[PDB]
Amino acid sequence: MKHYLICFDVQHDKTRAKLSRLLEKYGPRVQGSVFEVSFKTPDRKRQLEYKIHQIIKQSNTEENNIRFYNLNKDTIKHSHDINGNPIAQL
Amino acid sequence: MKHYLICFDVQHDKTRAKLSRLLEKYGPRVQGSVFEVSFKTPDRKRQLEYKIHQIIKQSNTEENNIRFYNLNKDTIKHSHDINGNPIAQLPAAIVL
Amino acid sequence: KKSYGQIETQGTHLVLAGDAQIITTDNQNLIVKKDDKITHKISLEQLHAVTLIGLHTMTLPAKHRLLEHKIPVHIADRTGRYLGAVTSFQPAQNNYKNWFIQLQMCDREPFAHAIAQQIVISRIHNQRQTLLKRKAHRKQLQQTLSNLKKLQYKVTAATKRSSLNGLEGSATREYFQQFNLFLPEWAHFSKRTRRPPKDPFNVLLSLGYTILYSHTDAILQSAGFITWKGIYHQQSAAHAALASDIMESYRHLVERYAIYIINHGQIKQDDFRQEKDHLGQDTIRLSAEARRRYVGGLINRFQKFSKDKTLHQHLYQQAQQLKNAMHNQQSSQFQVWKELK
Amino acid sequence: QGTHLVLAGDAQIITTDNQNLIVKKDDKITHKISLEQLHAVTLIGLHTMTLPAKHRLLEHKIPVHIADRTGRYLGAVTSFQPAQNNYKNWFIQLQMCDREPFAHAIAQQIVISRIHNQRQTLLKRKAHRKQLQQTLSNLKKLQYKVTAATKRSSLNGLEGSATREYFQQFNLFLPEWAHFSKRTRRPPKDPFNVLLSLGYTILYSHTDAILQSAGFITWKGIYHQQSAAHAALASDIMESYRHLVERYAIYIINHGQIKQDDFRQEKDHLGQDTIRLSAEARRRYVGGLINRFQKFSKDKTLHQHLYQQAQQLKNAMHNQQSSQFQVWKELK
Amino acid sequence: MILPSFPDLTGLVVNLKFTARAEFSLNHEMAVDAFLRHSLNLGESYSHHLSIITPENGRLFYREGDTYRFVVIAMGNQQQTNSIWHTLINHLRKNIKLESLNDLFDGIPVSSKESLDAYTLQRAMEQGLAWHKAANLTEQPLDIQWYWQSTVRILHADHKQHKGEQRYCRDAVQLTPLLLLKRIYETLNNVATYFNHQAWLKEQAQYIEIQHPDLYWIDTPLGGMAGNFTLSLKPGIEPGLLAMLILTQMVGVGQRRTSGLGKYWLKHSLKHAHLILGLKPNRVTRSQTLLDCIIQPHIISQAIAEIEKKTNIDTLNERTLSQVQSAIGQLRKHQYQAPKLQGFTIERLLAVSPLYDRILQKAAAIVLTPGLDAIMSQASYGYRKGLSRQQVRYEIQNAYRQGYHWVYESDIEDFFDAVYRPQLINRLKSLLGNDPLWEQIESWLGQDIHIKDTIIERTPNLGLPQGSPLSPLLANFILDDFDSDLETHGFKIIRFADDFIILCKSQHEAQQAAHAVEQSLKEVKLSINVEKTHIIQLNQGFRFLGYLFRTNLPPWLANLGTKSPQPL
């Protein structure tokens, strides 16, 4: 049981379109290119990264501009919006 | 001290430019439009928030998709990219 | 910019032991340029202290910014002897409470005597222990150890604070006279020469002590203390008395690393540079690369303290314990380190 | 001791010859002091300091006291021995700033000196003496009452009456356009209050920095209220020297270096109407006032004089005697 | 040439005494209209010849010994309505007594009434053209302010589309200068035609402008709109338009002017050469002014009984009563001059006036309360005492849907430092009519505090003094005018049960205003202690006025920012 934050900036729109459509199911699209993902067992993380490798091989660009961050139970507590609204609460 | 990462998505072509020109001072432009910042006293965070609000008033469209995600020590410890490289890491003592 | 571990609660401790850096400011960041080449752009929100060993510059607006944010900076020279510090005398939030408490409590005679007795007993026990882990020279080192025991046997019976200086001086003398047995012949010495270090071995000690002192001083000043007034060190020469008082127990980590470096061939006599300085005095120093290697190794050995706690996270604990000893007016709460039997 | 060198001008450059300290301004040597006769350095503003100079000073145990452009005191490049003076006299000040015989003796002397100096200011005109004989006799009568008043509020009333009787007469000196009548307003509406306000702020800041450098706690005052938003001791000691600003302001307006053109009428962001001084005129006035500070005496400048006064007050507190501290009175 | 003919207006001012305890509504044109209809019994022709001006409005509870004044205006040539009116009105003794009758134009009393003065059309043209001659610089804005008589009913572009009660004008945007001039021409042409190229010309010659409107909707238990606006005149206008303005000052504009609705008055710019034309401002005015009602003894005794609970009296009371009686004599003499404030410690330091002036202010508040309460109940900016709980929760949830996620504790105190007084005085002058009390009101609100030989002033024409009795009454009377200034900054107020609640999107401007105020107060204290300043002018921060001694954001933002909000 781990929360993660998924962010990217891939240059070509069609190449990152498959990234976006793959990542819709795993977590909500919280912002333009940012995803909130919840995992139960690391094997799902491994297979998701394997598919991300598949599409970045498809792009033939070698984009390492995919970044995963963690979101702990109290890291959520101090997280918010500009208007003070709490965010990423489950 | 508290470590935050600021992620914003604004469509006004000039307002996005002005936020880009503001936030590069406090922390590195780590991503295309995602920055990492650090503060020691929360009043310094409030000052930055007020500057951001002042800039986004000129949009006249009221954009509000600007998020401050916290980052802990163990949260940074578990974070990585796909390659396995640890990310958002900070040094304890630089021996320049 | 070889980093050395994960950031602490208070921040990162920048060091400049290199060659001829020039610190400048951004009003938000600290930029280190060597020959118009940028080497670092550290933010002022993460900086904790800074040490300047060598011939490093600091522009005056940078001094204004580091004096506003109350960030200490300590200075030294290429030989390694200490020079001074750029510190401010206004308290944290203008609350003069803890400073007044400390200045009252440090000159009380029974309290200060108890803590000075603890520090001296810790230092002599640590010295006896470090002379005890060299098996192959045990026959050469029996009598000396017994004599140190006798000196320790009198430290409990010392009834005035004026006798502790003499007892610790005699202990340190009989301790340092025994390093001629371990060290090679080219690095022999008989006396700790402090202000002008004039031996190959003494430069190592006088360059490690300032890193150790800067660490404990930055920790103490972040705790809330005023480091200039001391308990056991009344009259000092350019060292802040309280930092140079607490680091007494922890200064076998610099007299063991030096032996390890000299013996195991990491530093050999081809590194030392000898000159005459400013009037003509035989001064031995380290070139820039040997200084960087020595300081980096020392900080690395600081990080690998006893497990679950680095040295910074042990010194902050001991500072809190000392503060609680002084506020409650009990000398028994503060416990000296006293390395394991 | 020795010379306590103070740099409060504009961008001097400090260099060392390894046996002397040389301060040059536009490559003209302004100071050259041996390191055995130097006791401290005070840097008010931006002054470049060559690195051998800093190392030579730190090796000789000579503190360098660093202060901001306005005059705020930040800190000092020191070591153990020069920094023992910044805290070895904190407790005795807090003791001796509350004991009423001592504090009231000093607060009597300060007001005596203030009224004496503001008599001397009118004595030096020598062109409207006949209109001012009455005012000078009145000020003498008010001064003689300070020797007996045994409370603080009486001192406040006497000093307030003396100050009103001193400012009631400046309409004879100033020209037609600069004539001012009503007391000073926090948002100014007349030029002369603006000039006085700039002068008072500059003098207060510099007095504060020089008091802090000597080892004092400047919020514990002997005659004013211990409070935030200002330093009590700095606004306390600066009263004896307030006549310099007033004399200089009269001089500037009379000799024509500032005319009616330089003042600008405007409304602030708060919307309240103000009249202020233009940027060129403000820079000119501040430079001239610092020049008058530097022309205090042939031997000492004003900052060295205030350091000597702070040392005298320190000795007076240390030995408990309340009359070893003699105040500046502008004796001819 | 604009009007080739017009009837000869004539008038009577009748002053009558009350012998009984009588109570009116807030607008008096209905009762007086019914009085004349049940008295004269003329039938249809009363609509064609007569009209009513009632100077007294907004005074609800009358009393014995109080008079009443109103004006009757008649139109036509060789009418005998005034004759039978005189004969019937002379014997009107109970209820209603009679004091006197005065001719409107000559000013002589009603006796010798063979023929009255005739406001001939040529006289209207003269009193307009000479005014134009004496007021034309051709480079002047010539602003004149327009006050209503609390009701008018006009049609915005005569819209048939809206089809109902919505068909009338009820806000500033529906006020069109061409629409007003067209309605004026319609009424004047109707009156002339009872006894075309032209309508084209008046379309071109519109140069006038409507500035700073304050108009709103009042629904009489009917409908009407009430308020004032600054009508501004450009130089190209000819005296012909002015003649229409001045004649319509008496004839009227709007629907159903027979019931007296749809008249106005206009107060020209000051410092003009004294030229009084048509109707005189000192004739059509309340017979017993407001200040006489202030100085009536039983109201003063009532005020003394009201204030004495938190009086904290410390001095002799016979001197207080002699002082209030002497001040009553001075007010009747029209020579009073208010005392300046004094700052007393309670802990917190509060600045209050001496107690007798406080008594006079409480008396004025007691007098003014019923009319203002009745006008707040009957108007659009009205408190809703009986709140529909489902509707109120629905409004809160709708505002949450808008984005207003934070609420504040509601206190009127926070809005004492932002009130702009001339708007308030203009609104009162429109409701209760021209009166000599209003000047006095300003002199009570704009005083200066004395603390330890320091004069703390306030910015001119801004603010209401805390710790005064008129302030809580007059603050929420004109609270609605802040709505736009709350709209730009993302604030909303919801009113219910003589109360309200504050809703906001975010809390950053409040904290910046609070931090700006704190810094300003610290600098003011520093410049007290250093530069020996003696007159201090504060714009904001009076609540922390004790602190001194022991871009611009509006001043209510700081007072909100001193609090900590709550989410819903």
Numbering used by the authors:
A (entry chain A): 1 to 90
B (entry chain B): 1 to 96
C (entry chain E): 641 to 981
D (entry chain D): 650 to 981
E (entry chain C): 1 to 94, 111 to 211, 222 to 247, 258 to 382, 389 to 592, 617 to 634
From the paper:
In some CRISPR systems, a reverse transcriptase (RT) fusion to the Cas1 integrase and Cas6 maturase creates a single protein that enables concerted sequence integration and crRNA production. As observed for previous CRISPR integrase structures, the Cas6-RT-Cas1—Cas2 complex is heterohexameric, consisting of a central Cas2 dimer and two distal Cas6-RT-Cas1 dimers. In this study, we identify a type III Thiomicrospira Cas6-RT-Cas1—Cas2 complex containing three active sites for CRISPR spacer integration, reverse transcription, and RNA processing, and we observe all three activities in our reconstituted system.
The Cas1 and Cas2 domains largely resemble those of the E. coli Cas1–Cas2 complex; however, there are some notable differences. When compared to the E. coli Cas1—Cas2 complex structure, the C-terminal α-helical domains of a given Cas1 are very similar (2.3 Å RMSD), while the linker and N-terminal β-sheet domains are offset by ~5–7 Å. Each Cas2 protomer has a ferredoxin-like fold, as observed in previous Cas2 structures. We found a cluster of residues (R832, R834, R835, and H879) adjacent to the active site that undergoes a large conformational change between Cas1a and Cas1b. In the non-catalytic Cas1b domains, these residues appear to coordinate an unknown density, potentially corresponding to a metal ion or water molecule. In the catalytic Cas1a domains, this density is not observed and the residues of interest are pushed away from each other, seemingly to accommodate the insertion of an α-helix from the RT domain.
